[PDB]
Amino acid sequence: NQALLRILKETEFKKIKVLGSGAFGTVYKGLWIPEGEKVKIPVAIKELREATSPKANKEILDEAYVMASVDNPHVCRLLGICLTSTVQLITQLMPFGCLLDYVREHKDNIGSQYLLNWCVQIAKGMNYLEDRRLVHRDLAARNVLVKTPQHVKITDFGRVPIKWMALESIIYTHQSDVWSYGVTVWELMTFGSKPYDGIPASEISSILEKGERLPQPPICTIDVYMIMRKCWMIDADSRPKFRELIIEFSKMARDPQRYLVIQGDERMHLPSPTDSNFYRALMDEEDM
Amino acid sequence: NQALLRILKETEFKKIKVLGSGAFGTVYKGLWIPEGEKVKIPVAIKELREATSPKANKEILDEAYVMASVDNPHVCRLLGICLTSTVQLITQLMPFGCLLDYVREHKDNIGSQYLLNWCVQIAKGMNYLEDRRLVHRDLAARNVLVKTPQHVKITDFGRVPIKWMALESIIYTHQSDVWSYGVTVWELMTFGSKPYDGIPASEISSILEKGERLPQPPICTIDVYMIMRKCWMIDADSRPKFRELIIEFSKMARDPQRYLVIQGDERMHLPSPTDSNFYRALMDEEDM
Ligand SMILES: CN1CCC(c2ccc(-c3ccc4c(c3)C(=O)N([C@@H](C(=O)Nc3nccs3)c3cc(F)ccc3O)C4)cc2)CC1
Ligand SMILES: CN1CCC(c2ccc(-c3ccc4c(c3)C(=O)N([C@@H](C(=O)Nc3nccs3)c3cc(F)ccc3O)C4)cc2)CC1
Ligand SMILES: Nc1ncnc2c1ncn2[C@@H]1O[C@H](COP(=O)(O)OP(=O)(O)NP(=O)(O)O)[C@@H](O)[C@H]1O
Ligand SMILES: Nc1ncnc2c1ncn2[C@@H]1O[C@H](COP(=O)(O)OP(=O)(O)NP(=O)(O)O)[C@@H](O)[C@H]1O
Ligand SMILES: [Mg+2]
Ligand SMILES: [Mg+2]
């Protein structure tokens, strides 16, 4: 339990390159140098843009131990922490970056089988988080990291993203996460489009009350767009459960081209078991 | 089966830094760039110092598929290959380097619990290789790679190292590997000493026939030096099996200071479950 979150010294890791920033901190690629060792281990380091107090660190630690406790192939685990003036959090470095940026830069080489499997994997991770009774509160294509193209994990859970929140959050339940899951799915199926592009956030809750939802992405059949609309029902309990989302997106993943119309989908593919085994043993030794 | 050894193009990986060389090839740290992807994945690349023919590549591939087929936490798996004029082999990059260099550079911070566990892990991997009916033929502290300080794996098996070979090899059986295991153990317990230092290789088989073995390392009790001597029996079948080596070195690992006398052993230690979990999730996601 307590053994799941390593407390680090400043002197045993170094931030070497910035990777990006959110409205909570800045993310660096970093090197972890174990005491007495001559090696340099690449890590990801989030340093909060908000310097803290020692009593406030008691809040941070109380949640950090929980996020260090997740054990699921499609959920990122918080690994370490260094409680400087500004707190730094450490996790596994994902060289493929987030899924949002990934789809935007590969939108012309992304097939139906990859898209659909990603929706399954993200759902498995949300279903795990629900079984641990952890509400994500910030699910987005930006907070889905790519370990390998075949393997995605969910990050930055358990901590406003108005365009991703349920109407009752603009209340955070697992059913409110289901909403954010639908928005994440829409981001993938639109190859990274910005939801409600150009509409100011202060006015999203208005358009949701009048019945407007995100439009059907061009590559979605009705079976896929039905699911996304169901995630955006005003009644939270009427939304589909994550356990069900797994079942339906797995069904569609065994016949992908039936449920996603993508130009050049017979050229786009999935890696031969030859390429997957080479992927996993180099970067992704997790079971799966 | 065939899906366990990825064939690579030249254009999808690059050698960026040399790491060392043996009398068979040169090892580089390399970057694997997946087709269509914008990331750079660190790998290890062995390029043979011997340019080959296409029919000779049929030999190489026939063995490479076997080495790509090992599934054991303490055995390195061959992952890929690029069959240029000089063949390049690819495997997971171990930033901690080999165990030989590791012990030499940490000899003043290495305790009995680490040394003994390493002997267990190396034995587990040799016991696996015996169960797959693969003779190592070049077991040494140089060919034991450090994934993390707590986790070592055996490399470069299944391909002369006179000072590591059994007398009947100077015949390669699993019992001849047991000999090389004893020599590997002696290398660790001597914090990286060179076996038979200063004695020319052409004259090692002579000294072995007259009964000379490696000396008892200063930190070994008799129980440990008894095992090492048993690995060097002239009768191969009289040597202990790897299955037994596991049992005896595990026994000694539950009471390490009873079997290894190391100055400052109460200061040297093992990482708290806090530090191990941080190690594994960053670098070593294998089960164990
Ligand atoms: C300021 N005033 C006083 C103090 C209060 C406060 C309460 C809690 C935190 C806290 C604690 C723990 C975390 C986070 C935040 C967080 O953002 N965390 C991510 C994560 O670290 N991401 C990464 N990117 C790259 C490298 S590390 C994360 C990673 C992961 F693998 C799984 C879940 C997860 O949440 C972990 C901070 C401040 C707030 C109000
Ligand atoms: C020249 N004339 C004609 C041709 C004949 C020939 C026959 C077989 C090979 C062959 C095939 C396969 C391998 C090896 C050698 C080998 O050296 N291999 C290691 C390995 O690649 N190490 C690494 N270091 C860093 C990056 S890759 C290795 C790695 C591992 F993870 C597990 C086992 C293993 O053996 C694999 C070459 C030539 C010989 C005589
Ligand atoms: N483990 C990781 N490995 C590599 N890059 C990462 C990792 N975690 C986050 N990033 C990237 O670091 C950048 C900053 O992340 P972050 O601070 O979380 O902002 P954000 O995810 O875009 N918005 P938010 O997470 O909702 O605050 C993004 O481009 C992420 O993809
Ligand atoms: N996977 C790996 N990751 C990092 N370094 C490695 C890896 N495999 C080998 N090395 C290192 O690369 C260097 C060259 O290795 P190698 O070519 O095997 O020579 P050697 O092991 O010292 N002698 P030999 O293996 O018996 O031919 C050594 O310093 C090894 O520790
Ligand atoms: Mg993020
Ligand atoms: Mg070697």
Curated annotation (Swiss-Prot), chains A, B:
Q: Where on this protein does the Glycyl lysine isopeptide (Lys-Gly) (interchain with G-Cter in ubiquitin) crosslink form?
A: 17, 38, 55, 58, 210, 241, 251
Q: What is the effect of changing residue 69 to I?
A: Found in a lung cancer sample; constitutively activated kinase with higher levels of basal autophosphorylation; more sensitive to gefitinib than wild-type
Q: Where is the active site?
A: 138 (proton acceptor)
State how changing residue 48 to F affects the protein, per the record: Found in a lung cancer sample
Location in or out of the cell: Cell membrane; Endoplasmic reticulum membrane; Golgi apparatus membrane; Nucleus membrane
For the modification N6-(2-hydroxyisobutyryl)lysine, the affected residues are 46
Question: Which residues participate in ATP binding?
Answer: 19-27, 46, 91-92, 156
Q: In which tissues is it expressed?
A: Ubiquitously expressed. Isoform 2 is also expressed in ovarian cancers.
> Residue limits of the Protein kinase domain?
13-260
Residues bearing PTM Phosphoserine? 272, 276
Give the modified residues of type Phosphotyrosine. Answer: 279
What outcome follows a substitution of residue 25 to S?
Found in a lung cancer sample
The effect annotated for residue 20 to C is:
Found in a lung cancer sample
Q: What is the effect of changing residue 20 to A?
A: Found in a lung cancer sample
Write out the PTM section of this UniProt entry. Phosphorylated on Tyr residues in response to EGF. Dephosphorylation by PTPRJ prevents endocytosis and stabilizes the receptor at the plasma membrane. Dephosphorylated by PTPN1 and PTPN2.
- What outcome follows a substitution of residue 88 to R? Found in a lung cancer sample
How the protein is affected by changing residue 10 to K?
A: Found in a lung cancer sample
Q: Which family does it belong to?
A: Belongs to the protein kinase superfamily. Tyr protein kinase family. EGF receptor subfamily.
Quaternary structure per UniProt?
A: Binding of the ligand triggers homo- and/or heterodimerization of the receptor triggering its autophosphorylation. Heterodimer with ERBB2. Forms a complex with CCDC88A/GIV (via SH2-like regions) and GNAI3 which leads to enhanced EGFR signaling and triggering of cell migration; binding to CCDC88A requires autophosphorylation of the EGFR C-terminal region, and ligand stimulation is required for recruitment of GNAI3 to the complex. Interacts with ERRFI1; inhibits dimerization of the kinase domain and autophosphorylation. Part of a complex with ERBB2 and either PIK3C2A or PIK3C2B.
Associated disease: Lung cancer: A common malignancy affecting tissues of the lung. The most common form of lung cancer is non-small cell lung cancer (NSCLC) that can be divided into 3 major histologic subtypes: squamous cell carcinoma, adenocarcinoma, and large cell lung cancer. NSCLC is often diagnosed at an advanced stage and has a poor prognosis. Neonatal nephrocutaneous inflammatory syndrome: An autosomal recessive disorder characterized by intrauterine growth retardation, premature birth, fragile skin, recurrent skin infections and sepsis, failure to thrive, nephrocalcinosis, and nephromegaly with tubular dysfunction. Some patients have chronic diarrhea, and necrotizing enterocolitis.
- Tell me the function of this protein: Receptor tyrosine kinase binding ligands of the EGF family and activating several signaling cascades to convert extracellular cues into appropriate cellular responses. Known ligands include EGF, TGFA/TGF-alpha, AREG, epigen/EPGN, BTC/betacellulin, epiregulin/EREG and HBEGF/heparin-binding EGF. Ligand binding triggers receptor homo- and/or heterodimerization and autophosphorylation on key cytoplasmic residues. The phosphorylated receptor recruits adapter proteins like GRB2 which in turn activates complex downstream signaling cascades.
The protein here is known as Epidermal growth factor receptor
